[PDB]
């Protein structure tokens, strides 16, 4: 639900031989660029390279964001894909370089299967046995079981104020106690499964999530209690100490087979918004052996770099970083391709369009940017709906285009300049 600008893109739409089709999983046209994206998507699936970088280049509206999203769709949910805007690097809490490194680490994932168990039920009895252990009885709709519990866990029970008739979820490996409520009969339903729940959680994490969880301590009950109360900003992790140690432990678990590394993608939009010190950090950073594949997108040609105030470079990116990057060019659509895109968007968005309405809307797309023809569909359909019709008749597009101006027409109006 909730259609969005790219929600028709279901994949790159290559065939089994690589070559792009004229129209496929949402995408239409961009034969050469979709072919190039299809070549790099197997670089991603290979899990073999590190820090490889791609620049999707071309005018605004030529599908470059759409191709990056098509890659993300082509892969699925089993590998990470991190959207960032180059504008996002200007953090006020964190130095730009560290925002950039954090995002480099969001894009490396780690799958890990824990067969784990939790004991839950209505507690029928507690007896501690200086406490050697605690015997606790738990009841569910499938019977009762008597548990022996590690005496350290006996602290948690008293902290949660559990007593017989409560429903609790004592977790086997952590020893963590959560009091889910009072039992229904006295409030939460008596759990309807077995008292000893066991399941293989196969859910995955990322390197950055790990770093963040290791940045700050938890618990302690001493001076640390007050660290549980201050405002909690983010701070930089340490390159040659902590995040490297994280690498060591992750490698230890990969060797044991407990975890599997899934290198993902970092997709940076509006890369021209990065500072020059960001560009140069970036081209010191994607030469590292642990980096993801990084996809850059830029929609402006030869212009001045940020933070230099006079240095001009193609695509707004310094020649240093434009080396060590593979450029995929995207190009402007023909009227036929724009007609097809408008049709695909309409049928995605739930709209019916009469053939003559579609043809003139595409002609609008020739006088004006494609994205604007795509804008007009929903309000035109809304007018048609308010005139009781199902289809967009030409009477509606060729009139809704008078209420709303495009960039060029409104600029011509602004040329009265007072």
């Amino acid at each position: 639900q909730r259609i969005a600008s790219h929600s028709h893109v279901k994949g790159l739409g290559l065939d089994e031989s690589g070559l792009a089709k004229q129209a496929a999983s949402g995408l239409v046209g961009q034969e050469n660029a979709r072919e190039a994206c299809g070549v790099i998507v197997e670089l991603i699936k290979s899990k073999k390279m590190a820090g490889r970088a791609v620049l999707l280049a071309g005018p605004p509206g030529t599908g470059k964001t759409a191709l990056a999203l098509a890659i993300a769709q082509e892969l699925g949910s089993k590998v990470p894909f991190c959207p960032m805007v180059g504008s996002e690097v200007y953090s006020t809490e964190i130095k730009k370089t560290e925002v950039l490194m954090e995002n480099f680490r969001r894009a490396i994932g780690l799958r890990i299967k824990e067969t784990k168990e939790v004991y839950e039920g209505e507690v029928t009895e507690l007896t501690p046995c200086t406490i050697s252990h605690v015997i606790i009885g738990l009841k569910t709709a499938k019977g009762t079981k008597q548990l022996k519990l590690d005496p350290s866990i006996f602290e948690s029970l008293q902290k949660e104020r559990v007593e017989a008739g409560d429903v609790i979820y004592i977790e086997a490996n952590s020893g963590a106690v959560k009091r889910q409520g009072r039992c229904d009969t006295y409030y939460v339903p008596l759990p309807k499964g077995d008292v000893h729940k066991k399941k293989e959680i196969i859910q995955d994490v990322t390197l950055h999530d790990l770093d963040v969880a290791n940045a700050r301590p938890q618990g302690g009950q001493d001076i640390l209690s007050m660290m549980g109360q201050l405002m909690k900003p983010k701070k930089t992790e340490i390159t040659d100490k902590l995040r490297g140690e994280i690498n060591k432990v992750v490698n230890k678990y990969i060797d044991q087979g407990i975890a599997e590394l899934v290198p993902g993608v970092l997709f940076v939009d509006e890369v021209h918004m990065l500072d020059i010190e960001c560009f140069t950090y970036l081209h010191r950073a994607l030469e590292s052996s642990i980096a993801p594949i990084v996809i850059f997108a830029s929609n402006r040609g030869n212009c001045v770099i940020r933070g230099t105030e006079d240095i001009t470079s193609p695509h707004g990116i310094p020649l240093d970083l434009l080396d060590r990057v593979m450029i995929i060019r995207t190009m402007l659509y023909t009227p036929q391709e724009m007609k097809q895109i408008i049709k695909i968007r309409a049928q995605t968005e739930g709209i019916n369009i009469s053939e003559e309405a579609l043809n003139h809307l595409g002609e609008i797309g020739t006088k004006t940017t494609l994205r604007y023809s795509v804008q007009l569909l929903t309000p035109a359909n809304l007018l048609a709906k308010i005139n009781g019709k199902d289809s967009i008749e030409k009477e509606h597009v060729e009139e809704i285009s008078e209420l709303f101006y495009d960039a060029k027409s409104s600029a011509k109006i602004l040329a009265d300049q007072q």
Partner: protein, 219 residues
């Protein structure tokens, strides 16, 4: 004082968005930060590798029981065939899980470890005019710090004392309106949510409220 202190209101599920019991992963296998004040270089590098308790030895101590000590002296129907099988089955499960957890709870070593930090950590007032605690004149830093330099740092206690005469006279500003904490937060909350905040406030106000007693004259 305004009883019109506002209280925010929310849904149950909103206050329960970031909880899940048997779909979340165990992060206890990754937390290096939790070792540093509590685990030793020797423990991880030297003891555990030698005294690693294999599945074997714990299945062994699950054999016939051990006999009692003797410290006093001084001289200087029937049974279900399937029931016993199930008991055997879950005893085996139990022991294999002791192995799994006892291995997993000692799997990674400290970044530094307690003795490294102890070696590096200097006596607490690192570069001050005033010395650290000294056991006595038998050890060097007793004979390096003068008392006359100590009389000049004027710990916050004498700051309060010597200001007390003007604290009594010149502190008179109050906010024209006052309200209880920033808001209350009503809902159909998670049951554990309230006990934990109350326990945390107990844990705070028990420790450093006596430390706020010196500020009481100003407050």
């Amino acid at each position: 004082i305004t009883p019109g202190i506002c209280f925010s209101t929310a849904s149950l599920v909103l206050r329960a968005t970031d909880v899940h019991p048997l779909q979340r992963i165990d992060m206890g296998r990754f937390d290096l930060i939790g070792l540093e004040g509590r685990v030793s270089r020797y423990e991880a590098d030297t003891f555990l590798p030698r005294h690693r308790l294999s599945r074997r030895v714990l299945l062994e101590v699950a054999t016939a029981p051990d006999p009692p000590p003797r410290p006093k002296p001084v001289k200087m129907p029937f049974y279900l065939d399937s029931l016993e099988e199930k008991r055997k089955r879950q005893r085996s499960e139990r022991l294999e899980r002791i192995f799994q957890l006892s291995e997993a709870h000692g799997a990674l070593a400290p970044v530094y470890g307690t003795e490294v930090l102890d070696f590096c950590t200097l006596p607490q007032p690192v570069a001050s005019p005033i010395g650290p605690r000294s056991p006595g004149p038998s050890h060097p830093t007793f004979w390096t710090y003068t008392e006359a330099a100590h009389r000049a740092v004027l710990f916050p206690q004498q700051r309060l004392d010597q200001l007390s005469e003007i604290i009594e006279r010149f502190i008179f500003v109050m906010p024209p309106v006052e309200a209880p904490p920033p808001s209350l937060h009503a809902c159909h909350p998670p049951p554990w949510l309230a006990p934990r905040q109350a326990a945390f406030q107990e844990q705070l106000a028990s420790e450093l409220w006596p430390r706020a007693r010196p500020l009481h004259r100003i407050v």
